[PDB]
């Protein structure tokens, strides 16, 4: 996160670390609990994973540092790419992470919502995107979960900065117009997250975006709404 702050032990228990563990342990994206037994993270992800057996979800992390040899995990059974999918910035940039066991949810691990039915054309004032990203090119993953407000920004106004893509329905935007707070490289896969009448609901996916925090540039999500019905099928 660019021109994020900080945030607090517990602030944003939905929000998973996918660490990665070939050829070393590191922080490889976000996701989210959707679920008690899955997450919900993006499909440019798995890139370079070779099976879901070098996967390992950490849950009610704040600091990585936090994360020993001791600390539990959740081994990831199944990993689920929509079929569509080919490349971030082409759409359908969604996974689903199904895991080995059943999370029993806390104050530390809790579920986010899907976009309600019924909240088709409910006007999001209130979003929010959290991860251990970069705060500039050329940065390292951070230490202390990240979280930055940020502003959806109509499909029409996303299309007019991106005319070299095809900015589709299945994608939603977000950015302020001179730029200083974003998502970028590391907080790939994490929650778009935003508050209705009180509850949280996951409305984006952090997929792409054309540097990070750049004016007029804004972040580029998946917009989760649009593929509840394949999350219910893959999950029912
Ligand atoms: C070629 C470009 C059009 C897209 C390209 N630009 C990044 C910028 C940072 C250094 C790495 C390359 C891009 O995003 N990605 C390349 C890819 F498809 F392999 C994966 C994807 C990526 O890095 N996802 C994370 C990300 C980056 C910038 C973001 C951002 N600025 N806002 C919200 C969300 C943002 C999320």
């Given at each position: 996160?660019?021109g994020?702050?900080?945030?607090?032990?517990?602030?944003?228990?939905?929000?998973?670390?996918?660490?990665?563990?070939?050829p070393?342990?590191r922080?490889?994206?976000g996701?989210?609990?959707?679920?008690?037994?899955?997450?919900?993270?993006?499909?440019?992800?798995?890139?370079?994973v070779?099976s879901?057996?070098?996967?390992?979800?950490?849950?009610?992390?704040?600091n990585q540092?936090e994360?020993?040899?001791?600390?539990?995990f959740?081994?990831?059974?199944e990993?689920?790419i929509?079929?569509?999918?080919?490349?971030?910035?082409?759409?359908?940039?969604?996974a689903?992470?199904?895991?080995?066991?059943?999370?029993?949810?806390?104050?530390?691990?809790?579920?986010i919502?899907?976009?309600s039915?019924?909240?088709?054309?409910?006007?999001?004032?209130?979003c929010w995107?959290?991860?251990?990203?970069?705060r500039?090119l050329?940065?390292?993953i951070?230490?202390?979960?990240?979280?930055?407000?940020?502003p959806?920004?109509?499909?029409?106004?996303?299309?007019?900065?991106?005319?070299?893509?095809?900015?589709?329905?299945?994608?939603?935007?977000?950015?302020?117009?001179?730029?200083?707070?974003?998502?970028?490289?590391?907080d790939s896969?994490?929650?778009?997250?935003?508050?209705?009448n009180?509850?949280?609901?996951?409305?984006?996916?952090?997929?792409?975006?054309?540097?990070?925090?750049?004016?007029?540039?804004?972040?580029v999500?998946?917009?989760?709404?649009?593929?509840?019905?394949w999350?219910?099928?893959?999950?029912?």
């Amino acid at each position: 996160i660019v021109g994020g702050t900080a945030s607090v032990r517990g602030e944003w228990p939905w929000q998973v670390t996918l660490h990665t563990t070939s050829p070393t342990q590191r922080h490889l994206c976000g996701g989210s609990i959707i679920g008690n037994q899955w997450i919900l993270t993006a499909a440019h992800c798995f890139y370079g994973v070779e099976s879901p057996k070098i996967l390992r979800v950490y849950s009610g992390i704040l600091n990585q540092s936090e994360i020993k040899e001791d600390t539990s995990f959740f081994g990831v059974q199944e990993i689920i790419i929509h079929d569509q999918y080919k490349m971030a910035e082409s759409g359908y940039d969604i996974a689903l992470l199904k895991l080995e066991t059943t999370v029993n949810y806390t104050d530390s691990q809790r579920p986010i919502s899907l976009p309600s039915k019924g909240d088709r054309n409910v006007i999001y004032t209130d979003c929010w995107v959290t991860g251990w990203g970069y705060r500039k090119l050329r940065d390292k993953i951070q230490n202390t979960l990240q979280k930055a407000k940020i502003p959806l920004v109509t499909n029409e106004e996303c299309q007019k900065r991106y005319r070299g893509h095809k900015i589709t329905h299945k994608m939603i935007c977000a950015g302020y117009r001179e730029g200083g707070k974003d998502a970028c490289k590391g907080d790939s896969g994490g929650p778009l997250s935003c508050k209705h009448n009180e509850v949280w609901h996951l409305v984006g996916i952090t997929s792409w975006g054309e540097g990070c925090a750049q004016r007029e540039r804004p972040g580029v999500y998946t917009n989760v709404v649009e593929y509840v019905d394949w999350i219910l099928e893959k999950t029912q």
